[PDB]
């Protein structure tokens, strides 16, 4: 239904799909969407999805371009779906969900999360949309996220930063924080008290704390004197060890950034997705130390400090949970005579 | 005609088409061309456009090596096609125009621009190349570019920057500057006044004048003062808003160069083409301001100037026409009690 | 033979192929490996070989993930195949031979080096693995390396940097220095003195000397000064002449690279591929000076010193060999009245 | 694996369970393998799916006399218990997702699990314990071969499809009966009529009045058979004078033309559905039709629906049940007489 | 190059060395040249090559009457010198490299290069100096029209393939002597029977005994022949009583199926081969069979070979040297009589 031309039309004279009516000459090529400007041919869209060419343009077109939350939080929520919107990952450059309500006559299921295929599925509702909160107290199962609070429902305050076209930002022109509702099988769930990841990136990277703030400026040695860290580890597992062919610890997103910041070096992301927890192939490029698989999460420093500091150090080897986006997160503690050797997070 | 072997010798050898005799074995594979270095292949070129791989790999090898006018001044000119030469539009990894001129066997329309399907096609012709400035004065329809005086004819002053390579310059070893004429059915016109775009980039942005100067230097408050701008709304237009979810403004070059220096933000091309008045798809990461079309003009400060205070403020909202690289561009005017509100252009 | 889905697995948990057993889904659509995670499809790997796309990536993962010698030095030595173990090409994303023993079924030749058809091919040996060093004596052609002394052969001392999961290095941590020995027909074969190219990036340049220091923190005049090269023409060849349309000189990449922490500029890397020499078109940004081929040689400036010092001045032009990264590299040497004009590399 | 799937299909003709690998290279959407230093092609990838997936899908596809995908589609199927439909009129597979059969097209490995619930599952009594997960569905379509305790069945066409080959079995039985559940009740499936599923270039008769209709001429078989009034040779032979050819909607009256004088027949909508619709051109005479709605009938059956109509009314709507679906035909009469009675696009 | 194979297959229908060049653009896989303004396909790549070398490949492929590409397989050759053998059966070249033919795919420009030593190069007689580079290669494989000093011949086959059709020479000569040498060696061609290359539909027979079984039935087929005990009619028409199709291995017993009711053929291996395989599905019946193995031997030469054998064991693998190389059989026997005989896989 509806029209490839006309949704061309949208994008080219209003950047995403707004509804207007109109037409243009589009082209498809391989995987490439293009449409005639003065008599040449512009590309539109790249399809990097494995969704056809047209569908991916109309999804993408009829994307969210207000702060929704970022994919790796829905996942861990355990959202199958959206009401009436379509959520694009683009870490992946593709929809976060498969089927559409309402959205695209080629990937809707149904065009409203009433219908009796939307019961078994989480649905995620938008309470900044009329009328999708009250859709949310009558579907089965879903997830509701407000800006303010809702009448008889307890609220879980959700992370700072939200993600704007792409962009994870914790705003200031709009608002980013959202509270969290969950219902399951009819019953409204309690969510779990939770860290969150920071979702920063190693090359901007803004410390959002006055310990993060000594952690870039002061040295190792008179940082771990500062804030008392003798016996956890923080060089090997923080800074990393860059002495052999294996390289040691480095796990935190702030020890990449300050490293990064003093020598360069190589992440391969073979895993190219949003998840609480990263893995990468990384080479130091100074050393020439390497690992496989180098889990990386964006913790807070002053967050890992007390998680760190909350454990049990007299077993050699356990599992550690951690709940972590709303998901529980493996780590893996290695301890001896009383002191951690190493403790890194896992990936699901 | 000619042969796909020959072609790519000449890029292996000459680094573009040189004339010279010889081959080297290819291979096409999808939308790639390969040639066998040692017993291995190596990529030598990505068809990113709508013709076959191997017809615009033969294109892009003939392409114009030397300081050609940028693909928006030839549009804007209504150039439909070029005497003996390939102009590369490296904003859209394509061929400027559809057909040749005595160039490639399957995209050429006629040997010589002499031809009859020619004459009513508007003929871009080369003053450096010798005997086309006679060529233009037998054309009926065409531009002309040339260094120097042409005898008995007019000239036009184009501007400052021109492409080499796909790197648009102010040439200083080679000359960029050139004198332009136009015909129309055999009657040589008269281009009018016109002002032109500085085709810098956000990143490498270079101040051009005092005033420009002045204003990525001094703060707002003193830059107005200085210059007496009280009224004109340069801190909207220019510098743009920034404190509600809206993006206010904003549509200066010159503007978004000095905000990427001490803020980043994201900027989609969902039009990528090389116009005079840019649409973009911004999200500043540090407010999350947004806005889906903001048009974008890079236009000397001075001149931009010249064009606020020679308008008339006395109606609420009205559409301005400004001659700009050769074409008619329309900019909204919206005022209010003597003093302007915005004063953005539009994109056709 | 062995399995797609399994080779994704190991991709996906130990990020190579590490031997290790599972399955998980796998899609294939174009030229690129998806993987399902959690209902969502998750680009794997890109296809940007010859070679079918299943096939590419089962080498990919595959790929050797210690310090190898870069592929120029493996090239020159006339290396036609590895013995179980794949180079990949980082410069050509693509392995760095046609065919494999005992890797892929479906690039396998052979499964061990020892077999009939490898005798007449240059089968690349690996003294750190087990057994390889007496695989090599046993073989008719190859080339080993080793990190230490090898009984009864005479080594050769290679380059100090070496390819690490694409990422050249003088390794700290590892060892990338190597002793090297070649054979053919049976016969070990004494390798020639050589020097060895640096293998820098323009923009992460580092100098690896004091006459380097000196050379990009001093003044032209007061280098050749200081180590006094007049009549070398030095200002033409290594640090370039802008002043006209056709861009003199600047051969070696020193000079490359402190022109662009200078003034930009852009090189077009027409024939993408790891060699000695290498072609670029190069466009100057600031003065519009340009160049089709310009070849380009990364030698320690010490060691150019050496080389245009050690040479007749009498004749206005001749071909001069260079022993360079194992292989014969043709000069090019003009001169005049005594005096060097120029002196420029050629490629094969 | 990939390669295991691979090695079914060279040893075993399709996907056996047995244990081996060989080398595969996938090019294009064509999956090839190495014999004695060559590439043979071993599938061409017609469908919307990845290659790969396609390719194991096909190879595990239902190679038993399985019911043809009208059917199914007409039953509202749309999944298959732990098996694989292959739509041979599409290159494709009948249904989307599977049910333990491909981790990529998987929505579960049993049909029990809670995914399955508001899907109608395919089951098939000749498999051991379907018959009890047909109990269980809430809801579902089986076919078994014999009767099943306690359920009231519904006789099944004579013909069922054979790797795609559309046949009454003689040395394998191909008819079945059938029953269908909707939201955990059992549904009574109603008295219905059964397309021939017969081709044009192989047509053979099926009864005394289809021999008659091939041997007899017009005038002598509406004589014989007393269809006078009923318009019987403008609807099933047809009419070649005009521009616009008239009539001609049943196979039978297609397949006697074309021994005669060929024809071309543009399926427009290539797919497995009780009403065929085809652009025709006669190539003796020039005439055509756009849309011409065809539908392979017994004579003997369309003979009884025509008669039973009343005649007294200018146009309406006659709902048909067939192959257990409402097919719509559009009746036009005339003094009593019949003018047309087509069927339309389902 | 690109534009001058172009012109050849143009204006000659293959390459014939002419000089001139047409405009070519490459789309997906095809060739396409501008006649008049407008794109023709030239060719549609079906390999595993790129599609301009494929092109080429088949455009200077050999146009004379070459041997089938079973022989030449069951001969170990791994390329050709100077020519290009199109496997038809494959729409790809029978080998991967060529010699002096090619620039992408030359591994050498003339066979006595050392790089051409342990591969097994086809040599044409007919072309000149090709004998005497036959004599200097370490392997290879060599036809000819006549006798060569010297060497020991093995006669070929009465029939080759022509631009794909495989026919026995009239106005041409297809039968050819064979040579083979390993290590530098020449070696003893072993005695081989052939087989008959001959198709479903044009089936025609080429014996008396042949025209018996066609035009006879089998209770005076068998007496005639006095094939009694042998299982005759099982291995050869085959048994279509039950769900799984028995023996029917014989394509001659499928050509006198075939005219009389039709079935289903899926080549699930499709290329040149001794001994075909199908998955075969009977229409009338339903009776059918994943693996089928089918060759196409002469009657009498079948005749011949079933009668040698000794009937006094359950089960024995029996090796027949067909089209030179082994070919395994199952035999399978019960109180002196055969129960079944049939070829396997290779």
Not at 143 to 160: A, F, M, N, R, Y
Not at 259 to 281: A, C, G, H, Q, W
């Given at each position: 239904n509806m029209s490839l031309e006309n949704v061309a039309f949208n994008v080219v004279n209003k950047g995403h799909f707004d509804g207007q009516q109109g037409e243009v000459p589009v082209s498809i090529i391989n995987n490439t969407v293009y449409t005639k400007v003065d008599g040449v041919d512009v590309e539109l869209f790249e399809n990097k999805t494995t969704l056809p060419v047209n569908v991916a343009f109309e999804l993408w077109a009829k994307r969210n371009i207000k702060p929704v939350p970022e994919v790796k939080i829905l996942n861990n929520l355990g959202v199958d779906i959206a009401a009436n919107t379509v959520i694009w990952d683009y870490k992946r450059d593709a929809p976060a969900h498969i089927s559409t309500i309402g959205v695209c006559s080629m990937t809707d299921i149904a065009k409203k999360p009433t219908e009796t295929i939307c019961a078994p599925l989480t649905?995620?509702?938008?309470?900044?949309?009329?009328?999708?909160?009250?859709?949310?107290?009558?579907?089965?199962?879903?997830?509701?996220?407000?800006?303010?609070?809702?009448?008889?429902?307890?609220?879980?305050?959700?992370?700072?930063?939200?993600?704007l076209n792409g962009v994870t930002l914790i705003g200031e022109a709009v608002k980013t924080q959202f509270n969290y509702y969950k219902k399951?099988?009819?019953v409204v769930q309690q969510l779990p008290e939770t860290y969150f990841t920071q979702s920063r990136n190693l090359q901007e990277f803004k410390p959002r704390?006055?310990?993060?703030?000594?952690?870039?400026?002061?040295?190792?040695?008179?940082?771990?004197?500062?804030?008392?860290?003798?016996?956890?580890?923080?060089?090997?597992?923080?800074?990393?060890?860059?002495?052999?062919?294996?390289?040691?610890?480095?796990?935190?997103?702030?020890?990449?950034?300050?490293?990064?910041?003093?020598?360069?070096?190589?992440l391969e992301d073979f895993i190219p997705m949003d998840s609480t927890v990263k893995n990468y192939f990384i080479t130091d490029a100074?050393?020439?130390?390497?690992?496989?698989?180098?889990?990386?999460?964006?913790?807070?420093?002053?967050?890992?400090?007390?998680?760190?500091?909350?454990?049990?150090?007299?077993?050699?080897?356990?599992?550690?949970?951690?709940?972590?986006d709303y998901t529980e997160i493996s780590f893996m503690l290695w301890c001896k005579d009383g002191h951690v050797e190493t403790f890194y997070p896992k990936l699901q």
């Amino acid at each position: 239904n509806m029209s490839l031309e006309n949704v061309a039309f949208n994008v080219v004279n209003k950047g995403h799909f707004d509804g207007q009516q109109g037409e243009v000459p589009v082209s498809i090529i391989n995987n490439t969407v293009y449409t005639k400007v003065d008599g040449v041919d512009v590309e539109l869209f790249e399809n990097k999805t494995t969704l056809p060419v047209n569908v991916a343009f109309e999804l993408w077109a009829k994307r969210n371009i207000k702060p929704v939350p970022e994919v790796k939080i829905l996942n861990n929520l355990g959202v199958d779906i959206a009401a009436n919107t379509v959520i694009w990952d683009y870490k992946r450059d593709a929809p976060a969900h498969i089927s559409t309500i309402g959205v695209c006559s080629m990937t809707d299921i149904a065009k409203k999360p009433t219908e009796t295929i939307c019961a078994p599925l989480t649905v995620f509702f938008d309470g900044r949309v009329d009328g999708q909160v009250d859709l949310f107290r009558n579907a089965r199962n879903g997830v509701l996220i407000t800006e303010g609070s809702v009448k008889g429902l307890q609220p879980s305050v959700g992370p700072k930063q939200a993600s704007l076209n792409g962009v994870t930002l914790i705003g200031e022109a709009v608002k980013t924080q959202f509270n969290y509702y969950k219902k399951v099988d009819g019953v409204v769930q309690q969510l779990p008290e939770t860290y969150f990841t920071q979702s920063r990136n190693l090359q901007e990277f803004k410390p959002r704390s006055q310990m993060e703030i000594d952690f870039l400026e002061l040295a190792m040695d008179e940082f771990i004197e500062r804030y008392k860290l003798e016996g956890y580890a923080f060089e090997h597992i923080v800074y990393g060890d860059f002495s052999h062919s294996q390289l040691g610890g480095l796990h935190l997103l702030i020890g990449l950034a300050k490293r990064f910041k003093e020598s360069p070096f190589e992440l391969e992301d073979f895993i190219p997705m949003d998840s609480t927890v990263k893995n990468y192939f990384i080479t130091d490029a100074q050393t020439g130390s390497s690992k496989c698989v180098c889990s990386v999460i964006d913790l807070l420093l002053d967050d890992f400090v007390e998680i760190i500091k909350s454990q049990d150090l007299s077993v050699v080897s356990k599992v550690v949970k951690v709940t972590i986006d709303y998901t529980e997160i493996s780590f893996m503690l290695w301890c001896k005579d009383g002191h951690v050797e190493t403790f890194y997070p896992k990936l699901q």
